[PDB]
Design a protein around this nucleic acid. Structure first.
Lengths: 53, 173, 226, 49, 63, 157, 228, 132
RNA sequence: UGAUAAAGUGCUGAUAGAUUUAUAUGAUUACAGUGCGUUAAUUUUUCGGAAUUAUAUAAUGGCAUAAUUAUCAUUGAUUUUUGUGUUUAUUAUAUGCACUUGUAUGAUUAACAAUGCGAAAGAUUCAGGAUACCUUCGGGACCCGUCUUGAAACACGGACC
RNA sequence: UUGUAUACCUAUACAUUACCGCUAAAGUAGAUGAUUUAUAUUACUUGUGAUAUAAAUUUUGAAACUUUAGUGAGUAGGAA
């Protein structure tokens, strides 16, 4: 139940959650992911999804 | 089921000739606490006298792994009954909880040695560090930085479409 | 004479609903005493366990009275010493439940009759739901549902002191001195079948599941059957 | 008491909107929030016995 | 399945005379009324003995 | 998070408002800044304003006895449990053809030249969206494979 | 005065009276006038009203009568509130998308096409033949005149001829099919109030004119994850 | 029609078919009328599946509507005119059926007298002779 | 964090069923609810509105002791029959008269609406019907009598009336 | 194949309900102005009771009606 993206942030292999949270922000991953080539494709199926009469 | 651990304590209920019997305790792995109070009695009948009816069960309480997201190697000292066969083993598993490694051992013995579970006595269960493990299928994972490309998914059956129009395609790029 | 019949049967009507209104008032002050007993009992055991941890001891809680005993298997291929315990427990049909006191004379009957039976230790909620929803009662050898407190009171108030339903829930749950009458007054509880069904029916509970002492998991199984 | 847990929830949620106080979504809220003045009497006027 | 209903589930008393004498069954009409409406066991003995046979109602002497 | 049981399925009743728990999205988000949630339960097929497709696949049976009062019906797009329960409650029909009346054009103008046997969906059958129906007469069995129609009424939402 | 108040009708086994309601009686006005009403009598001016005994020295008969009469109450509807664009699932206007106006005091639904768009009049639909869609037109001050209720268009009558009698009179019946002119008058009042508020928004395939195109269910569809 | 019973009940029949003697299809010497099979191996008698059913008493009719005709009424054979007058007081509960051997000459009085007494007959217009 | 437990917790959506000849020989019984009801304060949306507080008696809890009874362990803790006030909470009783389409109808199923008129002789509408069949289809399904531990038996008898 | 997980399907078993039987228990028998029920006059308690005048149900094949419970396999065989 996992599907792998192209992003690899950097933290130690035995890090706690605050080090992981610190590294998402420095990578600018939220701004990169929502404009990534087919996270766009995600939200068009989400738009197409169930679609009022 | 999933086999969480308990501490079952037992006495030998003290007829007045003897005051304050010596109180032995355990580490029982069991699906539920009704079956942990016949694993206490099975294991103690090897060790001290006092069966039930002639003993008591003082506090059986569940123990809740003390670091559920730390990642550690569990060595299990076992002994089982094969078809010709009482043996000892020392198996090593890699998990987060200690009831989850014991239950990863009760399947493995069933797979690899056919070991239906009434044959398995567990001696000890530890959290050995690393460079004390031996068990090459556990030492695979004792190296940062580990890579392995994946090939593993779900492939619904029939699907959200049984007669598909577009071919699942195990690969891309 | 009919000129005296309205004279007689209008005070026999006035006194009649003075009794019923009297016993409506007892059964609220009666069942409030009982319901406060159970709350103090539960907060006692919480208090005692939390004391014995701080006093660096153990608190072994009380071994249980009140089995609820269900017949789970068969009327075919049964041995005569286990056929006979199941007629002394009034367990003559599949999914028949009765209430049993746990003295040593009956545990060695619950061990004779073990593979045909499951038992365990009921809650208060399981005592109520079996007498509310499923509780029938025995009126001159006939089986009479409940539908009011007059079916319980008309047979157990001159001799014993049971008039309400919560009376009958009291001297069954807290095993009282008229438990012998409080549980032979009932019919055997003709329970349904579980929802989700069973586990194996011919292994012990502690093997992989069914017969014998489930012991606290008789509650979860009575939710399916009641 | 379940009807009293409701009023403490819809009051404490609506501190970001705090509109009314009249009849629509706050009849079952702000009426009983000001009927604690109707139990101001019970502490004040009942100590005459 | 339940248990187990041989006998004498069906009780083997009499509930009526075996007797087509009309003067005898008029006394059964009285004594069912008399037993039911006066619940004396005198009147239930007379009723139950009025059903009986020539054996079970033996003669009795004048002495 | 079962201490947050009131705030998992929480969006619309606080968007209504009925006692207002928490009106936050959980949307299978096309709005992308916090894109979450479970592209949950789909399986599309069509047919259907009235006359949603079912086929009478056979009676509701065990392997050697048949019980020809309930009837299993496979509906066109449904193949999980959530999908076959939409139709639960609703009214079904087996409509087919005969030739001869024993009736008149009292109503529309007929030789009574199309028959119908109505029924209800009572419940679901497996884990894949099959369903169980209970018609007024009984469904003759040469109806197996043929079209049953799931009328969208008695209409819930 | 007040404070009697049965406030059960939701909860309802904790039914909110009898911890309070008996606590207002200081023996208030223990009175009666209360006639033992002597109208029922064998009372004659000369009339001799007695009454009579017709056959109740009777028919030889348990003459046909059935048991007795428990009655209609609580009406509960789904959360469909006007003006939602419903979809008429059934009954002679099937497929057409109509607009809600109000509910009855019998749980029915008052719907117009409007008649200029759908050719669907002011008629009444059971909400078991309606899909209440997500398209709602805002009607922030619309009247819905209060003579529009259950006894309005409601059936009568077929006299079958003139109420003449039991003669067998020949063919050429024209029995009912009016509609009245006050029937026609009303959906000039509510449609002119609707065809201004329908048109009041930026248009789409219904929302300001095109509400005329009759829901059908095409290929690659559902009933069961179609958010209607 | 004529005087329908006394707020009639809806008759529920446990099964409508009748009972067919085992192997009565194989032989033209076996009537279909039910005989209990006594044979030691008989798969009907031993109640195997697929076979012809036996009449037990769970099939018995409701005691309210036992012997009620479809028209609501129990049946009463009528043999002459004075026997019809017994139904003067039973016409809310009984039909009347003229006995097969009552002639056409005398069946005319009986259908006459049973409009006056309002007896619903089961076979009116039988053995007429609908002429003069 | 989770697990176990309990509170008509509450809500939602369904399914199947609904004896009942209330006297072809015993009250439609009681309960409960709704309608006119001396007041006086205190609030409330402000509408015929609505809430609260104020009356005696009887309890029951929470609290503060003083007794008492009796026990795991006793620095104390649990417990039975009490007592009285300190007290702060909660239930019950004190709703009579007349009326009414509000429960058990003392196995309740009862209502709104659509279709269809049982025509003087004879149509039609709705529901039902293995009548002896025929048509169609799915499931079931060996041949009876018999002796036998065991019969469909490659045991015997029986071509048909 | 071994060890498990949920979710389903399936008896004539189990639960509820309708109906048949069997079993076991219980009720009912003033008919003459007997019993009720609704009104209509008086003794009186406020209210009830009694006299009177206004409609019915009941001659329960007493071997009949009415009420409630449980129950149901069967060769040889017995019995209604």
């Amino acid at each position: 139940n996992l599907h792998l993206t192209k992003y690899r942030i950097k933290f130690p292999y035995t890090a706690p959650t605050r080090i992981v949270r610190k590294a998402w922000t420095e990578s600018d991953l939220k701004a990169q992911w929502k404009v990534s080539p087919w996270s766009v494709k995600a939200q068009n199926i989400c738009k197409r999804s169930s679609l009022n009469d | 089921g999933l086999l969480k651990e308990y501490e079952v304590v037992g006495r030998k209920l003290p007829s007045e000739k003897e005051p304050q019997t010596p109180l032995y305790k355990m580490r029982i792995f069991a699906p539920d606490n009704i079956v942990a109070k016949s694993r206490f009695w099975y294991f103690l009948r090897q060790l001290k006298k006092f069966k039930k009816t002639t003993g008591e069960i003082v506090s059986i309480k569940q123990v809740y792994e003390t670091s559920p997201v730390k990642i550690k190697n569990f060595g299990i000292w076992l002994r089982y009954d094969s078809r010709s066969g009482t043996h000892n083993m020392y198996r090593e598993y890699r998990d987060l909880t200690v009831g989850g490694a014991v239950t990863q051992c009760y399947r493995d013995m069933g797979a690899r040695h056919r070991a239906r579970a009434h044959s398995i006595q567990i001696i000890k269960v530890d959290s050995i560090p690393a460079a004390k493990t031996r068990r090459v299928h556990v030492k695979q994972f004792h190296d940062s930085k580990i890579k392995f490309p994946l090939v593993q998914r779900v492939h619904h059956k029939g699907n959200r479409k049984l007669f598909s129009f577009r071919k699942p395609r195990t690969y891309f790029q | 004479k009919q000129i005296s019949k309205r004279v007689a049967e209008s005070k026999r009507r006035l006194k009649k609903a003075a009794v019923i209104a009297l016993r409506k008032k007892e059964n609220l002050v009666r069942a409030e005493k009982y319901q406060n007993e159970y709350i103090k009992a539960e907060q006692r055991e919480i208090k005692l366990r939390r004391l014995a941890k701080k006093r660096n001891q153990f608190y072994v809680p009380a071994e249980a009275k009140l089995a609820f005993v269900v017949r789970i298997r068969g009327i075919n291929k049964v041995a005569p010493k286990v056929r006979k315990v199941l007629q002394l427990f009034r367990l003559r049909q599949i999914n028949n439940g009765v209430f049993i006191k746990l003295n040593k004379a009956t545990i060695n009957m619950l061990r004779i009759a073990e593979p045909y039976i499951t038992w365990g230790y009921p809650n208060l909620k399981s005592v109520r739901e079996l007498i509310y929803k499923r509780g029938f009662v025995k009126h001159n050898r006939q089986r009479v549902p409940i539908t009011d407190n007059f079916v319980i009171e008309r047979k157990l108030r001159q001799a014993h002191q049971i008039q309400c339903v919560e009376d009958l829930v009291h001297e069954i749950f807290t095993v009282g001195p008229n438990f012998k009458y409080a549980s032979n007054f009932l019919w055997p509880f003709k329970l349904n079948t579980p929802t989700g069904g069973w586990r194996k029916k011919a292994n012990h509970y502690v093997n992989g599941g069914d017969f014998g002492n489930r012991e606290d998991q008789i509650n979860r199984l009575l939710r399916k059957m009641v | 008491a379940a009807e009293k847990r409701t009023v403490a929830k819809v009051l404490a949620k609506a501190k970001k909107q705090n509109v009314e106080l009249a009849k629509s979504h706050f009849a079952n809220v702000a009426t009983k929030a000001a009927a604690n003045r109707a139990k101001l009497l019970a502490a004040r006027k009942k100590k005459v016995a | 399945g339940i248990d187990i209903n041989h006998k004498y589930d069906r009780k083997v008393r009499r509930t009526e005379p075996k007797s087509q004498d009309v003067y005898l069954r008029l006394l059964v009409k009285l004594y069912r009324f008399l037993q039911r409406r006066t619940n004396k066991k005198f009147n239930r003995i007379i009723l139950k003995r009025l059903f009986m046979s020539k054996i079970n109602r033996p003669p009795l002497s004048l002495q | 998070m079962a201490d947050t049981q009131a705030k998992s399925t929480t969006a619309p009743k606080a968007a209504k408002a009925q006692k207002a728990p928490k009106a936050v999205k959980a949307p299978k988000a096309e709005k992308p800044a916090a894109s979450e949630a479970k592209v949950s339960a789909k399986k599309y097929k069509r047919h259907g304003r009235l006359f949603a497709k079912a086929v009478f696949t056979g009676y509701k049976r065990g392997l050697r006895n048949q019980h020809e009062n309930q009837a299993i019906l496979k509906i066109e797009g449904a193949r999980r449990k959530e999908h076959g329960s939409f139709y639960v409650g609703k009214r079904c029909v087996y409509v087919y053809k005969a030739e001869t009346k024993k009736c008149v054009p009292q109503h529309p103008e007929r030789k009574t030249r199309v028959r119908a046997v109505w029924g209800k969906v009572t419940r679901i059958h497996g884990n894949t969206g099959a369903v169980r129906a209970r018609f007024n007469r009984n469904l003759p069995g040469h109806a197996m494979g043929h079209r049953i129609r799931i009328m969208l009424y008695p209409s819930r939402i | 005065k007040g404070k009697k108040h049965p406030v059960n009708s939701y909860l309802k086994g904790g039914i909110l009276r009898y911890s309070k309601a008996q606590m207002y009686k200081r023996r208030a006005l223990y009175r009666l006038k209360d006639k033992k009403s002597p109208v029922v009598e064998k009372a004659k001016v000369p009339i001799k009203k007695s009454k009579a005994s017709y056959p109740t020295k009777t028919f030889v008969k348990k003459r046909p009568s059935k048991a007795n009469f428990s009655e209609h109450k609580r009406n509960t509807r789904r959360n469909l509130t006007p003006g939602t664009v419903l979809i008429l699932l059934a009954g002679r206007h099937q497929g057409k998308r109509v607009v809600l106006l109000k509910v009855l005091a019998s749980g029915l639904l008052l719907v117009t096409g409007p008649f200029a768009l759908n050719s669907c009049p002011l008629r009444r639909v059971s909400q078991r033949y309606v899909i209440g869609t997500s398209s709602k037109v805002d009607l922030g001050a619309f009247k819905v005149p209060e003579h529009l209720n259950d006894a309005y268009f409601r059936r009568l009558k077929a006299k079958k001829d003139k109420k003449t009698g039991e003669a067998d009179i020949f063919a050429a019946k024209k029995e009912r099919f009016v509609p009245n002119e006050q029937r026609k008058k009303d959906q000039k009042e509510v449609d002119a109030a609707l065809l201004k508020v329908i048109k009041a928004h930026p248009e789409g395939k219904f929302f300001a004119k095109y509400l005329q195109n009759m829901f059908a269910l095409h290929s690659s569809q559902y009933p069961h994850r179609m958010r209607f | 029609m004529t005087i329908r019973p006394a707020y009639r009940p809806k008759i529920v029949k446990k099964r409508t078919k009748h009972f067919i003697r085992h192997q009565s299809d194989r032989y033209a010497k076996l009537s279909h009328k039910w005989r209990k099979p006594k044979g030691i191996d008989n798969r009907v008698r031993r109640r195997f599946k697929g076979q012809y059913l036996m009449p037990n008493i769970g099939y018995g009719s409701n005691k309210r509507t036992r012997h009620m005709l479809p028209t609501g009424f129990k049946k009463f054979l009528v043999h002459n005119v004075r026997e019809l007058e017994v139904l003067l007081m039973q016409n809310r509960v009984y039909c009347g059926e003229i006995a097969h051997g009552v002639s056409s000459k005398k069946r005319k009085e009986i259908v006459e007298r049973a409009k006056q007494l309002s007896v619903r007959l089961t076979n009116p217009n039988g053995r007429l002779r609908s002429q003069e």
